[PDB]
Amino acid sequence: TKTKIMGILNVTNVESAVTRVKAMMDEGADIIDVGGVMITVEEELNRVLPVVEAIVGFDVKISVDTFRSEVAEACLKLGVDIINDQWAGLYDHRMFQVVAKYDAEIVLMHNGNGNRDEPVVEEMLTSLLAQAHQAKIAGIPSNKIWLDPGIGFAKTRNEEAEVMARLDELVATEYPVLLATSRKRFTKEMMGYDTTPVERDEVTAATTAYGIMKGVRAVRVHNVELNAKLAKGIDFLKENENARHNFS
Amino acid sequence: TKTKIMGILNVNVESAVTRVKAMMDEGADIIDVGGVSTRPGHEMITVEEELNRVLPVVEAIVGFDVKISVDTFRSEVAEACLKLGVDIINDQWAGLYDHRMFQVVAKYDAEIVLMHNGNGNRDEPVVEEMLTSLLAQAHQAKIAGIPSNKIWLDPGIGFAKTRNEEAEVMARLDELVATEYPVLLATSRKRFTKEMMGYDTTPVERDEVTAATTAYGIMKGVRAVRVHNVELNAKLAKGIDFLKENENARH
Ligand SMILES: Nc1nc2ncc(COP(=O)(O)OP(=O)(O)O)nc2c(=O)[nH]1
Ligand SMILES: [K+]
Ligand SMILES: [K+]
Ligand SMILES: [Mn+2]
Ligand SMILES: [Mn+2]
Ligand SMILES: [Mn+2]
């Protein structure tokens, strides 16, 4: 019933990572998204693995931002819960098998096809739904697949503005939607100037509120506390609204 | 047009000017100055004490490039302020405390915020009682000479209402917005935001849930928000206005 808060942990110390994870859990993170990725599968594993081994025992879900089944599989043997795939299984078809094999969840982020024929929304829907079908025919449950519009990838300024004005249509596919705009160019431009990254937390929080109201079920963010608490408030307001209107 | 940010200035004079400057920098469109409260159980003061507290501050900030609103329910304090060039009179009694208010406000061509207050022992639903009351007062503000597009309605979250009644109102902000008078939401760090937190915090820690009420309220159509943390809310309001314009522009 509650909006999930996926915290961002970029791994580009294991000790500092661990301390940061507890700090994030503390600020309200439901999922800790670890990511460290052109480098070698081996190099990617050299950065991501030591962290995953240290934090996977904690009482929080661990997502791993990777697009290669080899990185996803070593992580899943350690007990990881989600594979946040920026390519939506396009980069390595074997991602679907690795995930099915460990009864995990997977995020399918819209990416590629930058010079698309069709308008961005029809294309994103077509591609993402096509990837969802592949996930399932691999044996991954329907309810373990998330869709991500992929703000910041293979889309022009105009295309993303279109995508952000029609989030309801992605939500309408009934798959749980993860919004991930945090501190991106799109948020930089909401501010209207060349802001530094951190300066983008408040507009990012705006996307969270707006997205939750459009039906997004999770938000991927750098500033956990701000979004965790802004989301709590918005969730509260919608529920209160349903209650007082006897809407369900 | 954007959502206006009315910063709260609770009332020495230099200390106040400092805080007004900062609020302007954080994005404040209006600075709302008050020295009184209409909460039963709170200190009551004289018109004269309100003046000593309020007038020297208004005098020193009315020149700035920001609108000034004065939170008062007595027209003598109002006029004293309108004579210094103040732009808005924020009335916790919607002109029911002092019946000369609308005439004073319209005399200096100002704006007025009519806040829902009183009759906490009503037996009809809060919402229809508030609408009936606020619209009757508004109708009276126009008779006196205040144009409709300068009469604001405020649901008075935190005044003469039960937790049950505040939740009723927050779930139906659009009905107030539907009246077509510009709407000001003022929930900052109040008890309602404390329920949202679901626990006890110092006032400052209620800022994020206050900001959620801002995002939500803008979605519902309110035109301004009265807040303590101007920056968090000004920056948030800005993102929401953009998301909303973008969505309307694209449809
Ligand atoms: N128009 C309007 N004016 C108001 N003035 C004072 C308070 C609450 O007063 P207090 O409890 O003293 O706190 P603060 O002055 O910080 O808001 N609330 C409103 C309000 O909801 N709407
Ligand atoms: K875990
Ligand atoms: K001024
Ligand atoms: Mn639409
Ligand atoms: Mn006050
Ligand atoms: Mn309704």
Side-chain angles (χ1 to χ4, degrees), chain A residues 45-80:
Chain A
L45 282 147
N46 273 14
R47 293 166 199 197
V48 158
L49 229 62
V51 177
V52 166
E53 281 162 20
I55 71 170
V56 73
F58 295 148
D59 201 359
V60 66
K61 292 169 179 225
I62 304 303
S63 174
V64 160
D65 191 349
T66 187
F67 49 81
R68 301 183 279 189
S69 57
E70 298 91 333
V71 191
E73 175 150 43
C75 283
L76 296 173
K77 292 157 122 106
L78 291 172
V80 161

PDB file of all heavy atoms in Angstrom, chain A residues 45-80:
ATOM      1  N   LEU A  45      32.729  -7.084 -11.056  1.00  0.00           N
ATOM      2  CA  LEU A  45      32.566  -7.955  -9.903  1.00  0.00           C
ATOM      3  C   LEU A  45      33.541  -7.593  -8.800  1.00  0.00           C
ATOM      4  O   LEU A  45      33.235  -7.789  -7.631  1.00  0.00           O
ATOM      5  CB  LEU A  45      32.780  -9.417 -10.267  1.00  0.00           C
ATOM      6  CG  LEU A  45      31.670 -10.186 -10.970  1.00  0.00           C
ATOM      7  CD1 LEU A  45      32.321 -11.192 -11.899  1.00  0.00           C
ATOM      8  CD2 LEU A  45      30.764 -10.866  -9.952  1.00  0.00           C
ATOM      9  N   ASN A  46      34.709  -7.072  -9.166  1.00  0.00           N
ATOM     10  CA  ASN A  46      35.727  -6.692  -8.185  1.00  0.00           C
ATOM     11  C   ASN A  46      35.295  -5.517  -7.297  1.00  0.00           C
ATOM     12  O   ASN A  46      35.768  -5.358  -6.168  1.00  0.00           O
ATOM     13  CB  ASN A  46      37.044  -6.366  -8.900  1.00  0.00           C
ATOM     14  CG  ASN A  46      37.911  -7.600  -9.137  1.00  0.00           C
ATOM     15  OD1 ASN A  46      37.459  -8.739  -9.013  1.00  0.00           O
ATOM     16  ND2 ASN A  46      39.172  -7.370  -9.482  1.00  0.00           N
ATOM     17  N   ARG A  47      34.395  -4.697  -7.825  1.00  0.00           N
ATOM     18  CA  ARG A  47      33.868  -3.535  -7.111  1.00  0.00           C
ATOM     19  C   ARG A  47      32.582  -3.800  -6.368  1.00  0.00           C
ATOM     20  O   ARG A  47      32.393  -3.405  -5.218  1.00  0.00           O
ATOM     21  CB  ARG A  47      33.558  -2.434  -8.100  1.00  0.00           C
ATOM     22  CG  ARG A  47      34.743  -1.874  -8.758  1.00  0.00           C
ATOM     23  CD  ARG A  47      34.294  -1.068  -9.928  1.00  0.00           C
ATOM     24  NE  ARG A  47      35.410  -0.877 -10.836  1.00  0.00           N
ATOM     25  CZ  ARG A  47      35.455   0.039 -11.796  1.00  0.00           C
ATOM     26  NH1 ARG A  47      34.437   0.863 -11.995  1.00  0.00           N
ATOM     27  NH2 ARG A  47      36.535   0.130 -12.552  1.00  0.00           N
ATOM     28  N   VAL A  48      31.681  -4.474  -7.052  1.00  0.00           N
ATOM     29  CA  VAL A  48      30.384  -4.724  -6.492  1.00  0.00           C
ATOM     30  C   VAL A  48      30.322  -5.876  -5.486  1.00  0.00           C
ATOM     31  O   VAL A  48      29.736  -5.724  -4.409  1.00  0.00           O
ATOM     32  CB  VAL A  48      29.379  -4.822  -7.660  1.00  0.00           C
ATOM     33  CG1 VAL A  48      28.153  -5.580  -7.271  1.00  0.00           C
ATOM     34  CG2 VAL A  48      29.003  -3.403  -8.103  1.00  0.00           C
ATOM     35  N   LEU A  49      30.942  -7.004  -5.807  1.00  0.00           N
ATOM     36  CA  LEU A  49      30.914  -8.165  -4.917  1.00  0.00           C
ATOM     37  C   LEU A  49      31.284  -7.987  -3.442  1.00  0.00           C
ATOM     38  O   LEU A  49      30.524  -8.402  -2.569  1.00  0.00           O
ATOM     39  CB  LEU A  49      31.729  -9.318  -5.496  1.00  0.00           C
ATOM     40  CG  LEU A  49      30.891 -10.591  -5.434  1.00  0.00           C
ATOM     41  CD1 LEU A  49      29.679 -10.370  -6.295  1.00  0.00           C
ATOM     42  CD2 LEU A  49      31.654 -11.793  -5.925  1.00  0.00           C
ATOM     43  N   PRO A  50      32.444  -7.380  -3.138  1.00  0.00           N
ATOM     44  CA  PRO A  50      32.823  -7.201  -1.727  1.00  0.00           C
ATOM     45  C   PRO A  50      31.784  -6.441  -0.898  1.00  0.00           C
ATOM     46  O   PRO A  50      31.634  -6.674   0.303  1.00  0.00           O
ATOM     47  CB  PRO A  50      34.142  -6.441  -1.826  1.00  0.00           C
ATOM     48  CG  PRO A  50      34.701  -6.913  -3.133  1.00  0.00           C
ATOM     49  CD  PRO A  50      33.492  -6.842  -4.021  1.00  0.00           C
ATOM     50  N   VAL A  51      31.073  -5.529  -1.548  1.00  0.00           N
ATOM     51  CA  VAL A  51      30.042  -4.749  -0.880  1.00  0.00           C
ATOM     52  C   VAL A  51      28.824  -5.632  -0.640  1.00  0.00           C
ATOM     53  O   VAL A  51      28.328  -5.733   0.482  1.00  0.00           O
ATOM     54  CB  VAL A  51      29.620  -3.519  -1.719  1.00  0.00           C
ATOM     55  CG1 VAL A  51      28.491  -2.777  -1.030  1.00  0.00           C
ATOM     56  CG2 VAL A  51      30.798  -2.583  -1.910  1.00  0.00           C
ATOM     57  N   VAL A  52      28.348  -6.282  -1.695  1.00  0.00           N
ATOM     58  CA  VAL A  52      27.182  -7.143  -1.576  1.00  0.00           C
ATOM     59  C   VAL A  52      27.351  -8.205  -0.477  1.00  0.00           C
ATOM     60  O   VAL A  52      26.399  -8.491   0.250  1.00  0.00           O
ATOM     61  CB  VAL A  52      26.834  -7.763  -2.949  1.00  0.00           C
ATOM     62  CG1 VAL A  52      25.855  -8.914  -2.791  1.00  0.00           C
ATOM     63  CG2 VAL A  52      26.244  -6.679  -3.857  1.00  0.00           C
ATOM     64  N   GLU A  53      28.550  -8.775  -0.347  1.00  0.00           N
ATOM     65  CA  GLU A  53      28.824  -9.784   0.692  1.00  0.00           C
ATOM     66  C   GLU A  53      28.688  -9.197   2.079  1.00  0.00           C
ATOM     67  O   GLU A  53      28.249  -9.874   3.001  1.00  0.00           O
ATOM     68  CB  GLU A  53      30.262 -10.282   0.648  1.00  0.00           C
ATOM     69  CG  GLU A  53      30.653 -11.302  -0.374  1.00  0.00           C
ATOM     70  CD  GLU A  53      32.171 -11.334  -0.558  1.00  0.00           C
ATOM     71  OE1 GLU A  53      32.914 -10.872   0.341  1.00  0.00           O
ATOM     72  OE2 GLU A  53      32.630 -11.820  -1.609  1.00  0.00           O
ATOM     73  N   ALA A  54      29.106  -7.946   2.226  1.00  0.00           N
ATOM     74  CA  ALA A  54      29.053  -7.283   3.514  1.00  0.00           C
ATOM     75  C   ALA A  54      27.659  -6.854   3.945  1.00  0.00           C
ATOM     76  O   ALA A  54      27.311  -6.987   5.117  1.00  0.00           O
ATOM     77  CB  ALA A  54      29.978  -6.074   3.519  1.00  0.00           C
ATOM     78  N   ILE A  55      26.854  -6.356   3.007  1.00  0.00           N
ATOM     79  CA  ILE A  55      25.520  -5.828   3.336  1.00  0.00           C
ATOM     80  C   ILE A  55      24.270  -6.684   3.141  1.00  0.00           C
ATOM     81  O   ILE A  55      23.187  -6.312   3.604  1.00  0.00           O
ATOM     82  CB  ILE A  55      25.222  -4.493   2.571  1.00  0.00           C
ATOM     83  CG1 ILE A  55      25.017  -4.774   1.074  1.00  0.00           C
ATOM     84  CG2 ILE A  55      26.324  -3.453   2.834  1.00  0.00           C
ATOM     85  CD1 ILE A  55      24.489  -3.588   0.279  1.00  0.00           C
ATOM     86  N   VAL A  56      24.408  -7.826   2.484  1.00  0.00           N
ATOM     87  CA  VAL A  56      23.249  -8.647   2.185  1.00  0.00           C
ATOM     88  C   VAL A  56      22.604  -9.322   3.396  1.00  0.00           C
ATOM     89  O   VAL A  56      21.454  -9.751   3.327  1.00  0.00           O
ATOM     90  CB  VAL A  56      23.589  -9.654   1.064  1.00  0.00           C
ATOM     91  CG1 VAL A  56      24.495 -10.746   1.586  1.00  0.00           C
ATOM     92  CG2 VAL A  56      22.323 -10.197   0.435  1.00  0.00           C
ATOM     93  N   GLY A  57      23.345  -9.414   4.502  1.00  0.00           N
ATOM     94  CA  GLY A  57      22.815 -10.001   5.723  1.00  0.00           C
ATOM     95  C   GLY A  57      21.865  -9.067   6.457  1.00  0.00           C
ATOM     96  O   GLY A  57      21.047  -9.515   7.270  1.00  0.00           O
ATOM     97  N   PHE A  58      21.984  -7.772   6.184  1.00  0.00           N
ATOM     98  CA  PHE A  58      21.125  -6.767   6.799  1.00  0.00           C
ATOM     99  C   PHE A  58      19.663  -6.950   6.401  1.00  0.00           C
ATOM    100  O   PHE A  58      19.333  -7.557   5.374  1.00  0.00           O
ATOM    101  CB  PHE A  58      21.602  -5.356   6.435  1.00  0.00           C
ATOM    102  CG  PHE A  58      22.967  -5.003   6.982  1.00  0.00           C
ATOM    103  CD1 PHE A  58      23.807  -4.146   6.277  1.00  0.00           C
ATOM    104  CD2 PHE A  58      23.410  -5.514   8.200  1.00  0.00           C
ATOM    105  CE1 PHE A  58      25.064  -3.798   6.777  1.00  0.00           C
ATOM    106  CE2 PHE A  58      24.667  -5.170   8.710  1.00  0.00           C
ATOM    107  CZ  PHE A  58      25.494  -4.311   7.995  1.00  0.00           C
ATOM    108  N   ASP A  59      18.801  -6.406   7.243  1.00  0.00           N
ATOM    109  CA  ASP A  59      17.367  -6.487   7.085  1.00  0.00           C
ATOM    110  C   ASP A  59      16.809  -5.394   6.190  1.00  0.00           C
ATOM    111  O   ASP A  59      16.124  -4.481   6.652  1.00  0.00           O
ATOM    112  CB  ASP A  59      16.735  -6.395   8.460  1.00  0.00           C
ATOM    113  CG  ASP A  59      15.348  -6.956   8.500  1.00  0.00           C
ATOM    114  OD1 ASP A  59      14.836  -7.420   7.455  1.00  0.00           O
ATOM    115  OD2 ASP A  59      14.769  -6.934   9.602  1.00  0.00           O
ATOM    116  N   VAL A  60      17.124  -5.502   4.909  1.00  0.00           N
ATOM    117  CA  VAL A  60      16.671  -4.569   3.887  1.00  0.00           C
ATOM    118  C   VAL A  60      16.870  -5.350   2.582  1.00  0.00           C
ATOM    119  O   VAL A  60      17.687  -6.275   2.529  1.00  0.00           O
ATOM    120  CB  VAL A  60      17.482  -3.199   3.943  1.00  0.00           C
ATOM    121  CG1 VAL A  60      18.943  -3.402   3.589  1.00  0.00           C
ATOM    122  CG2 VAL A  60      16.846  -2.137   3.047  1.00  0.00           C
ATOM    123  N   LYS A  61      16.110  -5.002   1.550  1.00  0.00           N
ATOM    124  CA  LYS A  61      16.213  -5.677   0.261  1.00  0.00           C
ATOM    125  C   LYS A  61      17.388  -5.073  -0.477  1.00  0.00           C
ATOM    126  O   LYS A  61      17.589  -3.858  -0.418  1.00  0.00           O
ATOM    127  CB  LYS A  61      14.936  -5.459  -0.554  1.00  0.00           C
ATOM    128  CG  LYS A  61      13.706  -6.141   0.017  1.00  0.00           C
ATOM    129  CD  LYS A  61      12.442  -5.654  -0.688  1.00  0.00           C
ATOM    130  CE  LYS A  61      11.179  -6.337  -0.149  1.00  0.00           C
ATOM    131  NZ  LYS A  61      10.208  -6.808  -1.200  1.00  0.00           N
ATOM    132  N   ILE A  62      18.173  -5.908  -1.152  1.00  0.00           N
ATOM    133  CA  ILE A  62      19.310  -5.423  -1.921  1.00  0.00           C
ATOM    134  C   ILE A  62      19.019  -5.568  -3.415  1.00  0.00           C
ATOM    135  O   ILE A  62      18.699  -6.651  -3.926  1.00  0.00           O
ATOM    136  CB  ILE A  62      20.673  -6.159  -1.541  1.00  0.00           C
ATOM    137  CG1 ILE A  62      20.951  -6.032  -0.033  1.00  0.00           C
ATOM    138  CG2 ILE A  62      21.879  -5.547  -2.311  1.00  0.00           C
ATOM    139  CD1 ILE A  62      21.024  -4.587   0.502  1.00  0.00           C
ATOM    140  N   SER A  63      19.082  -4.444  -4.107  1.00  0.00           N
ATOM    141  CA  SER A  63      18.917  -4.468  -5.536  1.00  0.00           C
ATOM    142  C   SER A  63      20.325  -4.311  -6.055  1.00  0.00           C
ATOM    143  O   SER A  63      21.181  -3.713  -5.394  1.00  0.00           O
ATOM    144  CB  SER A  63      18.083  -3.293  -6.031  1.00  0.00           C
ATOM    145  OG  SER A  63      18.063  -3.291  -7.449  1.00  0.00           O
ATOM    146  N   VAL A  64      20.583  -4.871  -7.221  1.00  0.00           N
ATOM    147  CA  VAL A  64      21.881  -4.699  -7.818  1.00  0.00           C
ATOM    148  C   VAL A  64      21.709  -4.208  -9.253  1.00  0.00           C
ATOM    149  O   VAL A  64      21.110  -4.887 -10.094  1.00  0.00           O
ATOM    150  CB  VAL A  64      22.721  -5.983  -7.741  1.00  0.00           C
ATOM    151  CG1 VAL A  64      23.827  -5.935  -8.782  1.00  0.00           C
ATOM    152  CG2 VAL A  64      23.330  -6.109  -6.335  1.00  0.00           C
ATOM    153  N   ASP A  65      22.220  -3.006  -9.499  1.00  0.00           N
ATOM    154  CA  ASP A  65      22.191  -2.333 -10.801  1.00  0.00           C
ATOM    155  C   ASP A  65      23.258  -2.929 -11.729  1.00  0.00           C
ATOM    156  O   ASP A  65      24.411  -2.484 -11.745  1.00  0.00           O
ATOM    157  CB  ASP A  65      22.447  -0.825 -10.581  1.00  0.00           C
ATOM    158  CG  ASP A  65      22.194   0.038 -11.820  1.00  0.00           C
ATOM    159  OD1 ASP A  65      22.014  -0.489 -12.917  1.00  0.00           O
ATOM    160  OD2 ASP A  65      22.174   1.280 -11.690  1.00  0.00           O
ATOM    161  N   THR A  66      22.870  -3.942 -12.499  1.00  0.00           N
ATOM    162  CA  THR A  66      23.783  -4.585 -13.433  1.00  0.00           C
ATOM    163  C   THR A  66      23.006  -5.072 -14.648  1.00  0.00           C
ATOM    164  O   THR A  66      21.792  -5.278 -14.574  1.00  0.00           O
ATOM    165  CB  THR A  66      24.566  -5.761 -12.772  1.00  0.00           C
ATOM    166  OG1 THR A  66      25.556  -6.235 -13.687  1.00  0.00           O
ATOM    167  CG2 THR A  66      23.647  -6.925 -12.411  1.00  0.00           C
ATOM    168  N   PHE A  67      23.707  -5.254 -15.765  1.00  0.00           N
ATOM    169  CA  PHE A  67      23.069  -5.706 -16.992  1.00  0.00           C
ATOM    170  C   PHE A  67      23.736  -6.946 -17.591  1.00  0.00           C
ATOM    171  O   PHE A  67      23.488  -7.303 -18.742  1.00  0.00           O
ATOM    172  CB  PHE A  67      22.945  -4.556 -18.029  1.00  0.00           C
ATOM    173  CG  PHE A  67      24.219  -3.761 -18.270  1.00  0.00           C
ATOM    174  CD1 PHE A  67      25.215  -4.238 -19.126  1.00  0.00           C
ATOM    175  CD2 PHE A  67      24.413  -2.524 -17.652  1.00  0.00           C
ATOM    176  CE1 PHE A  67      26.389  -3.495 -19.363  1.00  0.00           C
ATOM    177  CE2 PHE A  67      25.579  -1.776 -17.881  1.00  0.00           C
ATOM    178  CZ  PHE A  67      26.567  -2.265 -18.740  1.00  0.00           C
ATOM    179  N   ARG A  68      24.580  -7.606 -16.810  1.00  0.00           N
ATOM    180  CA  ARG A  68      25.251  -8.811 -17.285  1.00  0.00           C
ATOM    181  C   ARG A  68      24.969  -9.937 -16.321  1.00  0.00           C
ATOM    182  O   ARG A  68      25.264  -9.825 -15.129  1.00  0.00           O
ATOM    183  CB  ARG A  68      26.742  -8.552 -17.430  1.00  0.00           C
ATOM    184  CG  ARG A  68      26.949  -7.415 -18.392  1.00  0.00           C
ATOM    185  CD  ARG A  68      28.370  -7.118 -18.665  1.00  0.00           C
ATOM    186  NE  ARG A  68      28.996  -6.296 -17.638  1.00  0.00           N
ATOM    187  CZ  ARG A  68      30.205  -5.778 -17.790  1.00  0.00           C
ATOM    188  NH1 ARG A  68      30.860  -6.022 -18.915  1.00  0.00           N
ATOM    189  NH2 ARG A  68      30.759  -5.037 -16.845  1.00  0.00           N
ATOM    190  N   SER A  69      24.394 -11.014 -16.846  1.00  0.00           N
ATOM    191  CA  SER A  69      24.019 -12.169 -16.047  1.00  0.00           C
ATOM    192  C   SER A  69      25.119 -12.680 -15.121  1.00  0.00           C
ATOM    193  O   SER A  69      24.823 -13.124 -14.016  1.00  0.00           O
ATOM    194  CB  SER A  69      23.461 -13.291 -16.942  1.00  0.00           C
ATOM    195  OG  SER A  69      24.369 -13.698 -17.945  1.00  0.00           O
ATOM    196  N   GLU A  70      26.381 -12.601 -15.546  1.00  0.00           N
ATOM    197  CA  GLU A  70      27.490 -13.053 -14.704  1.00  0.00           C
ATOM    198  C   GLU A  70      27.561 -12.257 -13.408  1.00  0.00           C
ATOM    199  O   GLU A  70      27.823 -12.833 -12.354  1.00  0.00           O
ATOM    200  CB  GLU A  70      28.853 -12.888 -15.380  1.00  0.00           C
ATOM    201  CG  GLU A  70      29.087 -13.654 -16.658  1.00  0.00           C
ATOM    202  CD  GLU A  70      28.711 -12.886 -17.921  1.00  0.00           C
ATOM    203  OE1 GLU A  70      27.824 -11.997 -17.900  1.00  0.00           O
ATOM    204  OE2 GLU A  70      29.325 -13.190 -18.964  1.00  0.00           O
ATOM    205  N   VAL A  71      27.354 -10.937 -13.479  1.00  0.00           N
ATOM    206  CA  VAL A  71      27.412 -10.094 -12.276  1.00  0.00           C
ATOM    207  C   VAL A  71      26.142 -10.337 -11.467  1.00  0.00           C
ATOM    208  O   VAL A  71      26.186 -10.444 -10.241  1.00  0.00           O
ATOM    209  CB  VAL A  71      27.564  -8.555 -12.600  1.00  0.00           C
ATOM    210  CG1 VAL A  71      27.886  -7.754 -11.316  1.00  0.00           C
ATOM    211  CG2 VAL A  71      28.673  -8.332 -13.627  1.00  0.00           C
ATOM    212  N   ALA A  72      25.015 -10.445 -12.157  1.00  0.00           N
ATOM    213  CA  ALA A  72      23.752 -10.686 -11.485  1.00  0.00           C
ATOM    214  C   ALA A  72      23.765 -12.061 -10.771  1.00  0.00           C
ATOM    215  O   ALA A  72      23.292 -12.168  -9.640  1.00  0.00           O
ATOM    216  CB  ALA A  72      22.589 -10.570 -12.497  1.00  0.00           C
ATOM    217  N   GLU A  73      24.324 -13.095 -11.397  1.00  0.00           N
ATOM    218  CA  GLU A  73      24.360 -14.430 -10.781  1.00  0.00           C
ATOM    219  C   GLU A  73      25.243 -14.584  -9.539  1.00  0.00           C
ATOM    220  O   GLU A  73      24.882 -15.293  -8.597  1.00  0.00           O
ATOM    221  CB  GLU A  73      24.744 -15.501 -11.803  1.00  0.00           C
ATOM    222  CG  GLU A  73      24.908 -16.872 -11.160  1.00  0.00           C
ATOM    223  CD  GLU A  73      24.586 -18.021 -12.075  1.00  0.00           C
ATOM    224  OE1 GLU A  73      24.998 -17.973 -13.246  1.00  0.00           O
ATOM    225  OE2 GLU A  73      23.924 -18.978 -11.617  1.00  0.00           O
ATOM    226  N   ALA A  74      26.401 -13.943  -9.523  1.00  0.00           N
ATOM    227  CA  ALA A  74      27.259 -14.054  -8.352  1.00  0.00           C
ATOM    228  C   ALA A  74      26.591 -13.305  -7.189  1.00  0.00           C
ATOM    229  O   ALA A  74      26.655 -13.713  -6.020  1.00  0.00           O
ATOM    230  CB  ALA A  74      28.619 -13.481  -8.665  1.00  0.00           C
ATOM    231  N   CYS A  75      25.937 -12.201  -7.527  1.00  0.00           N
ATOM    232  CA  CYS A  75      25.241 -11.408  -6.538  1.00  0.00           C
ATOM    233  C   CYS A  75      24.056 -12.192  -5.976  1.00  0.00           C
ATOM    234  O   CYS A  75      23.880 -12.248  -4.759  1.00  0.00           O
ATOM    235  CB  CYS A  75      24.845 -10.065  -7.144  1.00  0.00           C
ATOM    236  SG  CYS A  75      26.283  -8.959  -7.230  1.00  0.00           S
ATOM    237  N   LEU A  76      23.252 -12.799  -6.850  1.00  0.00           N
ATOM    238  CA  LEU A  76      22.114 -13.618  -6.421  1.00  0.00           C
ATOM    239  C   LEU A  76      22.484 -14.869  -5.603  1.00  0.00           C
ATOM    240  O   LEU A  76      21.667 -15.346  -4.826  1.00  0.00           O
ATOM    241  CB  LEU A  76      21.250 -14.023  -7.620  1.00  0.00           C
ATOM    242  CG  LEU A  76      20.541 -12.909  -8.397  1.00  0.00           C
ATOM    243  CD1 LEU A  76      19.919 -13.526  -9.612  1.00  0.00           C
ATOM    244  CD2 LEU A  76      19.474 -12.200  -7.574  1.00  0.00           C
ATOM    245  N   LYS A  77      23.692 -15.413  -5.761  1.00  0.00           N
ATOM    246  CA  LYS A  77      24.074 -16.578  -4.954  1.00  0.00           C
ATOM    247  C   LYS A  77      24.313 -16.123  -3.516  1.00  0.00           C
ATOM    248  O   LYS A  77      24.199 -16.914  -2.583  1.00  0.00           O
ATOM    249  CB  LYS A  77      25.351 -17.235  -5.478  1.00  0.00           C
ATOM    250  CG  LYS A  77      25.215 -17.906  -6.826  1.00  0.00           C
ATOM    251  CD  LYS A  77      26.583 -18.010  -7.489  1.00  0.00           C
ATOM    252  CE  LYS A  77      26.983 -19.440  -7.824  1.00  0.00           C
ATOM    253  NZ  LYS A  77      26.880 -19.707  -9.283  1.00  0.00           N
ATOM    254  N   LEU A  78      24.655 -14.846  -3.349  1.00  0.00           N
ATOM    255  CA  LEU A  78      24.905 -14.266  -2.027  1.00  0.00           C
ATOM    256  C   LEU A  78      23.604 -13.882  -1.315  1.00  0.00           C
ATOM    257  O   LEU A  78      23.616 -13.483  -0.149  1.00  0.00           O
ATOM    258  CB  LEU A  78      25.831 -13.042  -2.143  1.00  0.00           C
ATOM    259  CG  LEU A  78      27.293 -13.296  -2.541  1.00  0.00           C
ATOM    260  CD1 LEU A  78      28.021 -11.990  -2.813  1.00  0.00           C
ATOM    261  CD2 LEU A  78      27.998 -14.058  -1.435  1.00  0.00           C
ATOM    262  N   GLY A  79      22.483 -14.002  -2.026  1.00  0.00           N
ATOM    263  CA  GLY A  79      21.185 -13.690  -1.449  1.00  0.00           C
ATOM    264  C   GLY A  79      20.588 -12.331  -1.773  1.00  0.00           C
ATOM    265  O   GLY A  79      19.846 -11.778  -0.962  1.00  0.00           O
ATOM    266  N   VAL A  80      20.900 -11.803  -2.955  1.00  0.00           N
ATOM    267  CA  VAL A  80      20.408 -10.498  -3.409  1.00  0.00           C
ATOM    268  C   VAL A  80      18.951 -10.681  -3.852  1.00  0.00           C
ATOM    269  O   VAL A  80      18.586 -11.767  -4.302  1.00  0.00           O
ATOM    270  CB  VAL A  80      21.335  -9.967  -4.554  1.00  0.00           C
ATOM    271  CG1 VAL A  80      20.667  -8.884  -5.389  1.00  0.00           C
ATOM    272  CG2 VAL A  80      22.607  -9.416  -3.941  1.00  0.00           C
TER     273      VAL A  80
END
